[PDB]
Design a protein around this ligand. Structure first.
Ligand SMILES: [Ca+2]
Ligand SMILES: [Ca+2]
Lengths: 123, 123
């Protein structure tokens, strides 16, 4: 879920607007992604893009015809930790977990200014 | 939020369909409520109805023109405890808290079969 992923990263990184700060970073953070991750942040993005690919092959996901970016799930942020809810259907829960791991990855890795708006010439 | 309150009570009482089991119980559990609570469950319902009344007087609530029953907020259920999310606006957070306290109250009090579909002749 885009609105929930944005919220998740803000839970971990309260000073950020994730849709601005983390969009179009490296080869993978943003729409698509190809090539070799340029750093560990971009590698968090590659893992999350693979988590969505895997979510897409799941039998449960084959119904909710809301790409993982508009498929909404339920979670909490409290005390800056994210909890995915037991209320989620199997597809929703799998996606909530991809998002949670990515938000956590993003908070633990360097941010490299020079890889933001990375020109795709060698992704 | 009705859909989230239902979920909250199921978080606390996993064997229930709360919209069936707790609707129209006593004088307060359900649409409105007047009179003296018939037992402690009904009294949980009176406290929750007063929590909604108080939510309604709040300055923040005066905008979201979705009565507290369709005003959606975010929460988690995990390990059978409810967490209201820091992502909630002040109105949403106040309502999430009314709901959470009521769900918890409902799980700690007797259920009296004889007060379900209570005829309103003396509420
Ligand atoms: Ca990507
Ligand atoms: Ca009531």
């Amino acid at each position: 879920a885009l609105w929930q992923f944005n919220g998740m990263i803000k839970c971990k990184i309260p000073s950020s607007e994730p849709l601005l700060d983390f969009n179009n970073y490296g080869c993978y953070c943003g729409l698509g992604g190809s090539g070799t991750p340029v750093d560990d942040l971009d590698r968090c993005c590659q893992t999350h893009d693979n988590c969505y690919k895997q979510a897409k092959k799941l039998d449960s996901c084959k119904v909710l015809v809301d790409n993982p970016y508009t498929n909404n799930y339920s979670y909490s942020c409290s005390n800056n930790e994210i909890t995915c809810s037991s209320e989620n259907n199997a597809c929703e829960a799998f996606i909530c977990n991809c998002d949670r791991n990515a938000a956590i990855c993003f908070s633990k890795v360097p941010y490299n200014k020079e890889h933001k708006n990375l020109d795709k010439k060698n992704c």
